[PDB]
Write a protein that binds this ligand. Structure first.
Ligand SMILES: N[C@@H]1[C@H]2CN(c3nc4c(cc3F)c(=O)c(C(=O)O)cn4-c3ccc(F)cc3F)C[C@@H]12
Ligand SMILES: N[C@@H]1[C@H]2CN(c3nc4c(cc3F)c(=O)c(C(=O)O)cn4-c3ccc(F)cc3F)C[C@@H]12
Ligand SMILES: [Mg+2]
Ligand SMILES: [Mg+2]
Ligand SMILES: [Mg+2]
Ligand SMILES: [Mg+2]
Lengths: 695, 690
DNA sequence: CATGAAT
DNA sequence: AGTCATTCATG
DNA sequence: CGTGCAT
DNA sequence: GACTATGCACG
């Protein structure tokens, strides 16, 4: 993987540690083979503060580093036998680039202090903008007086990378200096160590979620602080955790908003996946195609989502975990229900933002015509926080929300008469009313999920245990192996043979027992020692007001209602303004009919368009907007001189405006709309429970 | 790789040989695990009739079959020690699937005859449309409509009912009707000798519950199908615009998406996806690789695609994946598409029948020669070097004025190939032979230069190398000479190429015959190679070995078609307008009566009918008149309109003349060809020697 | 052995 | 996101 | 261990 | 077109 320099020289030769092969390539070319070596880093580097020193020695990335640098590692580290005088870390100028600098620095610290303490560890700062060339937004505006936003290294040409960051005379480097051995140790541990509590706290103290954001020296304590801070913030807000209102992670939201913009919906032909992904990756989500597709695939799997938001034709995976077809084979499109998440988006009902390009606005949250967060759930791993929200029956969640709208201050006990608990797509049995309450109240709670079973008598006095429903998030294939392993190992007596018998229209696992076999002894052992029964831990974290918040039912349902409120208000203002303008025009038209000839005469007498309008104003007191409409009518309209039809539209419009004003100017009338609409969604999408409950 | 059947049973168990892992998945899903096993084939099976039985034994796909079959191979083959009653071959219902069925059949014939002779080899017949239909006629019956482009697009539940269910599926049972009449066909289609195949293709291929089929007949409808496709719609360029179908789609799609040289770069993945979705129904990787190649200036004399980012190097290291790179058409590429919006070129339906695509581009310049092509199908192949834009055009221009121009004269304008990697081309005679018959072997030699050093030691400095030669591999093979001391003299080998220059230095030892060495490297490394012309293209839907003349005539013919087409289009436009403008000028003469007649009309339709009947306006005019906006009624100036009426009449005159006068037309075609030359002309890179 | 659209 | 093997014609 | 967006 | 390792929190 190493691309050596032509000659050796432990005094001039540099070692660029590049993020990714493709960038490691553009570097191999742009470099100067005389003294600049290249060593690509494929993937995120192993955290040498958490992983066991055993898994560390086995990591190819690390071992090949301790070698090429050539000076051993840790205690047996002689700074004299090194091969490079400068180790330059070069990553994308993105958040994941920051994460890498972090993971790396904690390594050159722990197992190569000497190297960093000597100021031999630098950090290449690639340019962010290119008009022109500038690093800070400030240097930007200056070049505009005298832009290709670089989202990564793979975007720039070789002769581009050399001139801007690779040329020792034209580049800028943040030389890592250890200014305080003590204040640097505590800084690294808090961020990279095992303990999670401290790290979570440190983020809560330093990271401001509510607000925004030639070689120069910089402390490790300060460097590790700045970098990990960024990666922290970004991963928390814009990656791992769902928005409390629409229950979507940014990637899922873009997949939907994109597919919808491209008219790729349930009422229309399937569109090839590779085409959907590509448009998403080029307009909204600047990340690996594979991730985008994987995300899109999951939204389509009915054994992971209680209400799939994407319909996909072809091999889209299975409960056995076997891989789905690549994006070149599959077709896809939004499910009908997903359409309800996007309802009214064209009506200015949601806060939009700019995309990485700055070429197109994207929604920060979707209108959500139903409480997606609870219905489909989420999960759920970031930095300092994590989330596991289970799926819920669409109807129940709605019955709850509708209640809470009439009773703002409802307690959990009353809500649970509507929302008894989770409803897994995979069905099965949920035990633990108490812990459910605890979860619905605090966000955390441990429940038990047990497989749905049944006994079948067989010839020869033999019995047979049959499993027809398994626990959420459990791999059928592996479960079957683990059970068969019980038999093979004889950890419990009486298992004759295991057999996955499920087919395209039914799940079925037959655990055939032996002649004289205690089928109760077996069924119990399996529940306890395999995943026929498991623990599900509610850990409901979500993003509220830009910050990660551990939340229960109340905060969720209220944040939703809140949101729906803003949306319906906005929607109603939009539709009113439209009806006002149209009402205005229709009013003018009805006048025009009574003076048709005069108006034609008056336009004939006019010199041009503008003059016609002034005459229409001065002579008949029409408004600008009314004159503009009259003057631009096509001649044939003079054949449709029918006032009663117009008067019907006038009336229909006044009424529409009345009802919209009522919504806008009265909170109760608005809340009734929410209820009316929520019930409609309920009637149209309602479906029976799949998971039964037990206490 | 195998997914086995629950219970072992030689009497009922079926073994599905599926094309691809993806389809292999959908199969495991919609299958009946009781007795149906699955075995994916990852890539084209190895031709067990062309390759050595040595490399044939070291084949994973082949081994796991001999193992999964469980009857061994060759002569040590017991049909009683098998594992399946039926061995089903299940591929896509496309051309490449057909080719796969062909490869697996020559294996089961050459190394498991008894299995085939026992009618145990079948072939699944997936549906082609969807009620489901296999025949284009069985659809019309269901008319009283999706098109499967592969197994992937089929949900596992549909797969079962239509092609996997023994009680609902259709199977072609392979049977050897004549062992002697079938030995020839397999030997000819899959043999090592080309000539017999080429001919077979010529003679037969016309470029224009279960059922038994012979091995002879089954190997025909299949290889015949694949041959025709890989020839017309894959490996070989159209003789006119010099593009293969993939490249044409890449350009056309990108162009339709407005992803051009004068606009911001678009993400590669976004383009590729749009291509694969609307036009080219194949791998996104291939499509990308093609797009990338069209952007590499050491492989194209005139790049058609500009691509920001790591698109590769002469060292041949991989380009950034399409997730990283952005791209757009080059300005010259624009000229390949020039006038495409003016119905100047034959369109057809895409695979999806949802959108039309062009079958050839207008080609405002002779791409086929300028950029070349290459070049491997079935029974045919192609190698066409790139040429100097200016030179090719000079020839075309001359041949326009002198249709029957001899090649000797044409070579005063088009002296020979002009590789973008420069270097030295040797063989005036062979160059002619090539321009004359389409074949010819020329020599390409690296641009060398000696540099004396300090100590009586010289040094060889290469500045240019042979087209299609990997710089990194060359430098290795040269250094291998030094390491092996095949010839004495070489001191060290240094690739000293930088971002702005190509330089390989071969330092020599003191008192070392630097002639002997340079000669050895020319012979035993790619410092010097033979380039073989094999100019094959597609003319009138068929492959044709051609020379400089047919190529240039085919071009000129085409340009004629385009220019004629383009002119009819612009003329029809000017006409329709001029026609409308006549009515408007008239209307003004009778404005009040016309408003009156509209005011008296019952509706739009009635108003037009009144205009025609009472004032003799035409439909087109009544529509224009009746959809005027009221404010028009303010105007009464006829002069401005008359000026437009004049301008249009002149444009129609000139355009008509181009269509009625062959000379006026050719003049035009020359005029433009020259503008292109003046705009994109560049100096020679390769030097010529005899 | 490479080449370049394919699986 | 690189890597691995095969087709086809050709010298 | 294995989850799901990232590299 | 599958395979291969990492981060991050959590039982
Ligand atoms: N020593 C470690 C190399 C890198 N490995 C994997 N890389 C994957 C992936 C999977 C890997 F095992 C991906 O799945 C992926 C993607 O975009 O989906 C990108 N990559 C990926 C590949 C290269 C790279 F530089 C960065 C990446 F994120 C494993 C061994
Ligand atoms: N025994 C041989 C399998 C197939 N291998 C490769 N496959 C590639 C590719 C490269 C391979 F080495 C590709 O490059 C590719 C593509 O679309 O670009 C598709 N494929 C590809 C992979 C799997 C498959 F089923 C069909 C394919 F075309 C290697 C081992
Ligand atoms: Mg990046
Ligand atoms: Mg991946
Ligand atoms: Mg196919
Ligand atoms: Mg490939």
């Amino acid at each position: 993987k190493l691309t050596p320099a032509q000659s050796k020289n432990p005094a001039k030769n540099e070692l660029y540690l590049v993020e990714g092969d493709s960038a490691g390539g553009s570097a191999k070319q742009g470099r100067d083979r005389k003294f600049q070596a290249i060593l690509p880093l494929r993937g995120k580097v192993i955290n040498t503060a958490k992983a066991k020193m055993a898994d560390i020695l086995k990591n190819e990335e690390i071992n090949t580093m301790i070698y090429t640098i050539g000076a051993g590692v840790g205690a047996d580290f002689s700074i004299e036998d090194a091969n490079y005088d400068k180790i330059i870390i070069m990553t994308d100028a993105d958040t994941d680039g920051a994460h890498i600098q972090t993971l790396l620095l904690t390594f050159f610290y722990r197992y190569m202090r000497p190297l960093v303490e000597a100021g031999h560890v630098y950090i290449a700062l690639p340019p962010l903008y290119k008009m022109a060339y500038a690093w800070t937004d400030g240097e930007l505006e200056e070049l505009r007086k005298q832009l290709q936003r670089y989202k990564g290294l793979g975007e720039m040409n070789a002769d581009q990378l050399w001139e801007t960051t690779m040329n020792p005379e034209t580049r800028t480097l943040i030389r890592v200096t250890i200014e305080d051995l003590a204040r640097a140790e505590r800084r690294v541990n808090v961020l990279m160590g095992d303990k999670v509590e401290p790290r979570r706290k440190w983020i809560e103290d330093n990271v401001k979620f509510t607000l925004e954001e030639n070689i120069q020296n910089m402390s490790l304590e300060d460097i590790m602080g700045e970098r990990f801070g960024r990666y922290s913030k970004y991963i928390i807000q814009d990656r791992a955790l769902p928005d409390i209102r629409d229950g979507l992670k940014p990637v899922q939201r873009r997949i939907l908003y994109s597919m919808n913009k491209d008219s790729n919906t349930f009422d229309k032909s399937y569109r090839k996946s590779a085409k959907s992904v590509g448009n998403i990756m080029g307009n909204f989500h600047p990340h690996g195609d594979s991730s985008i597709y994987d995300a899109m695939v999951r939204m389509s799997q009915n054994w992971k989502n209680r209400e799939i938001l994407v319909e996909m034709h072809g091999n889209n995976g299975s409960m056995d975990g076997d891989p789905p077809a690549a994006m070149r084979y599959t077709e896809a499109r939004l499910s009908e229900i997903a359409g309800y998440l996007l309802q009214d988006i064209e009506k200015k009902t949601v806060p939009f933002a700019w995309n990485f390009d700055d070429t197109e606005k994207e929604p920060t949250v979707l209108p959500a015509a139903f409480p997606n967060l609870l219905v489909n759930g989420s999960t759920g791993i970031s930095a300092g926080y994590a989330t596991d929200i289970p799926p819920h029956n669409l109807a129940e969640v709605i019955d709850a929300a509708v209640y809470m709208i009439d009773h703002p201050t409802a307690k959990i006990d009353k809500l649970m008469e509507f929302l008894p608990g989770p409803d897994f797509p995979t069905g099965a049995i949920i035990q633990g009313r108490d812990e459910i309450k605890k979860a619905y109240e605090t966000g955390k709670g441990r429940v038990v999920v047990r497989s749905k079973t049944e006994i079948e008598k067989l010839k020869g006095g033999k019995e047979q245990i049959v499993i027809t429903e398994i626990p959420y998030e459990i791999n059928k294939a592996n479960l079957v192996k683990k059970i068969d392993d019980v038999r093979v190992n004889n950890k419990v007596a009486g298992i004759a043979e295991v057999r996955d018998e499920s087919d395209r229209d039914g799940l079925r696992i037959a655990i055939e027992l032996k002649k004289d076999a205690n089928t109760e002894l077996v069924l119990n052992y399996l529940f306890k020692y395999t995943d026929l029964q498991i623990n599900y831990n509610f850990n409901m974290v979500a993003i509220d007001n830009f910050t990660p918040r551990q939340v229960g039912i109340v905060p969720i349902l209220s944040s939703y209602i809140a949101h729906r409120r803003e949306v319906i208000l906005a929607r109603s203002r939009f539709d009113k303004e439209k009806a006002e303008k149209r009402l205005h025009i229709v009013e003018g038209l009805i006048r025009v009919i009574s003076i048709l000839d005069e108006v034609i005469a008056l336009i004939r007498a006019s010199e041009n368009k503008a003059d016609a309008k002034e005459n229409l104003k001065v002579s008949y007191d029409f408004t600008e907007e009314q004159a503009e409409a009259i003057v631009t009518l096509q001649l044939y309209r003079l054949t449709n001189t029918d006032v009663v039809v117009l008067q019907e539209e006038e009336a229909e419009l006044r009424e529409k405006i009345a009802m919209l004003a009522a919504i806008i100017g009265d909170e109760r009338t608005m809340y009734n709309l929410m209820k009316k609409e929520l019930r409609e969604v309920k009637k149209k999408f309602a479906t029976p429970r799949l998971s039964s409950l037990e206490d």
